[PDB]
Structure 1
Amino acid sequence: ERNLRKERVGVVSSNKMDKTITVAVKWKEKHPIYGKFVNKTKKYHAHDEKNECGIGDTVRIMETRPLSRTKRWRLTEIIER
């Protein structure tokens, strides 16, 4: 009977750093003024206990407490390689 934390599904964009990865989340949303639908992307930093993620992977990450200067997410699953 707990609360729920934020979850983000994304694509791995960098893994050159030890025990941490970068996840890119992209979505299409409506422009406020002209009403066109444009693409936007955001980059998250996630903590992975093993360097088991290569460049490009549909993954899910979950919100955590600050684990570093810029590290607030943790890996949960790998949808595909």
Structure 2
Amino acid sequence: PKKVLTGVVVSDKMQKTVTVLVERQFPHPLYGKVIKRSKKYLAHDPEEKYKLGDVVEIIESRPISKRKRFRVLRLVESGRMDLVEKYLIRRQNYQSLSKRGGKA
């Protein structure tokens, strides 16, 4: 069975390709609490239909580019930036916490 995943398009800067945030939950191998990890999969939109903040299903497909082994299946729920924001702020915070120079 070809794997199917669910997530959110967080990147819309690429040609025919869309970045999908895919959240996964599971009990920790020793500490037992449910930890929530995640991953970005590069999908593949031929007709440039799927936009930012859309929840889509991913489906394992024939390799397409280096690192882009999935095609987009269908749309789940359009209109939900709230998720994307989270991705974005975390990115922003990443600009901080280094040895270049800290400010306010």
Q: Where does 1:20-39 land on structure 2 (aligned, <5 Å)?
A: 20-39=17-36
Separation in structure 1 between the aligned mates of residue 46 and residue 62 of structure 2, nearest angstrom: 16
- Given the alignment, which residue of 66, 76, 88 partners 1:79? 76
Give the aligned residue type for 2:24. Answer: W
Gaps of 5+ in 2: 79-104
TM superposition shift of 1:70: 1.1
Aligned residues between the structures: 78
What TM-score results when the alignment is normalised by the length of structure 1? 0.85
Q: Which has the higher helix share?
A: 2
Q: Which has the higher strand share?
A: 1
TM superposition shift of 1:27: 2.2
| RMSD, aligned α-carbons | 1.2
Separation in structure 1 between the aligned mates of residue 2 and residue 33 of structure 2, nearest angstrom: 31
Give the aligned residue type for 2:30. Answer: I
Rg bigger for which structure? 2
What TM-score results when the alignment is normalised by the length of structure 2? 0.68
Gaps of 5+ in 1: none
- Given the alignment, which residue of 43, 68, 81 partners 1:46? 43
The alignment-based identity, stated in percent, is: 45
- Given the alignment, which residue of 57, 60, 66 partners 1:60? 57
